Amino acid sequence: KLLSTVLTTSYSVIFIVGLVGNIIALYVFLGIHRKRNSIQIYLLNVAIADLLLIFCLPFRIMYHINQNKWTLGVILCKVVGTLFYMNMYISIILLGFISLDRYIKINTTKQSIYVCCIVWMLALGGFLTMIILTLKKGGHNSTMCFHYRDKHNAKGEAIFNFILVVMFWLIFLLIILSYIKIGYATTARNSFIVLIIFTICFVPYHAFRFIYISSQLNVSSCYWKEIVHKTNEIMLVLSSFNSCLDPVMYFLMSSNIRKIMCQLLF
Ligand SMILES: O=C(Cc1ccc(OCc2ccccc2)cc1)NC1(C(=O)O)CCN(C(=O)c2ccc(-c3cccc(Cl)c3)cc2)CC1
């Protein structure tokens, strides 16, 4: 109903804007650059991950068009879920490294390539392990995805959520202390953009997860879980907003983005 239609509109607009921005940014990064120290590599991989999320969005949009009905199987459903989170976590780790990298400057290249390549292999490995468990179980083909599921007998799965939510806080914690130390004019202003994106899109999402996981391992009334279900779907949209806050971040990290954007606007 109302929740479905607001999600449809928000997802449509976010997909369009993110697609345009990521396409332009990826074109500029791929077709102009010859020598890259570390920032170009980091921003290129961030652009690729954003492109992945943008290409994943239309399936969820179509799902919300059809009044919450799924008719394409289970494998596609789990592929969509896996890709969405996967991009969420890649974006949190590679945005961490840009700050850590952009602090030694104020206070070479082969090391940044090593870290950059490791992240993609572990994300790819985690993609495969979700497919294998889907085929093995091979359960009845239910028509209900993107919906609340209970984990009363699946406490191990709650541990997957439990590890991530706490681990995100250390990454958020270290970024704060890094800024405090730092807290040259251009460098200081730019690094403040990293904190803006990190605090708006991602910080709210993990905070409410404590209540969400708490209701999972507990008995809940009819009123309670409906409100929790209402909150999470809206709460995910805020996390998916990083696809459009990243393009403005490209603008302040390099002049090539600035020059092409200036050419297009002028
Ligand atoms: O960026 C990543 C990969 C990563 C790689 C290395 C890391 O440190 C090593 C390292 C760090 C810095 C430098 C050098 C080395 C840390 C993370 N992120 C993942 C993770 O390891 O934290 C998490 C998402 N991920 C899934 O496979 C995945 C999970 C959960 C779901 C899911 C959850 C709920 C519902 C549903 Cl349906 C699905 C889906 C997929 C990839 C690995």
Query: Which positions ≥6 away from 134 have C-beta within 8 Å?
Result: 74, 75, 78
Q: 2-32 and 242-253 are packed helices; what angle lies between their axes, rounded to 10 degrees?
A: 30
Domains of the chain: total = 1
| 6 contacts: CB under 8 Å, gap ≥ 6 | 234
Listed as own residue / partner, the contacts of 74-82 with beta carbons closer than 8 Å and 24 or more positions apart are 74/134, 74/139, 74/141, 74/142, 75/131, 75/134, 75/135, 77/145, 77/146, 78/130, 78/131, 78/134, 79/131, 80/56, 80/145, 81/130, 81/145, 81/146, 82/126, 82/127, 82/130, 82/131
Residues with C-beta less than 6 Å from any ligand 1 atom: 78, 81-82, 85-86, 89-90, 93, 115, 118-119, 122-123, 126-127, 130
Amino acid at the residue 37: N
Distance 44 CA to ligand 1 centre (A): 19
Q: Determination method here? A: cryo-EM
Report DSSP letters for 201-252, one per residue. Answer: IIHHHHHHHHHHHHHHTS---HHHHHHHHHHHHHHHHHHTTHHHHHHHHHHH
In degrees, to the nearest 5, what angle opens at C-alpha 228 toward C-alphas 3 and 61? 35
Q: Is 149 helix (H, G, I), strand (E, B) or coil?
A: coil
Q: How far is ligand 1, taken at its centre, from the CA of residue 54, in Å?
A: 19
CATH assignment at residue 212: 1.20.1070.10
Amino acid at 76: L
Give me the count of residues in the chain. 266
CA dist., res. 36 & res. 129, Å (int): 33
Task: Output the six-digit token pair for 226.
Answer: 């409906």
Paired tokens of 52: 């992945």
Q: Which DSSP helix (H) or strand (E) runs through 55?
A: helix 39-65
Q: Which residues form the domain of 106? A: 2-265
φ/ψ (deg, to 5) at 70: -110, 130
Closest to 190 measured CA to CA, from 254, 238, 258, 243: 254
The residues after which the chain has a C–N gap greater than 2.5 Å are 107, 183
- Helix or strand run (H / E) with residue 37: none
* Residue 236, CA distances (Å) to 39, 82, 209, 240 in order: 28, 14, 11, 6
18 Cβ neighbours under 8 A, 6+ residues apart: 50, 53, 54, 57, 243, 244, 247
For residue 96, how far is its CA from the centre of ligand 1 (angstroms)? 14
C-alpha span between 171 and 176 (Å, rounded): 9
> What does the alpha-carbon distance between residue 176 and residue 225 come to, in Å, rounded to a whole number?
34
Q: Which two tokens stand for residue 12?
A: 């449509």
Q: Ramachandran region of residue 73, left (φ > 0), alpha (ψ -120 to 50) or beta?
A: left
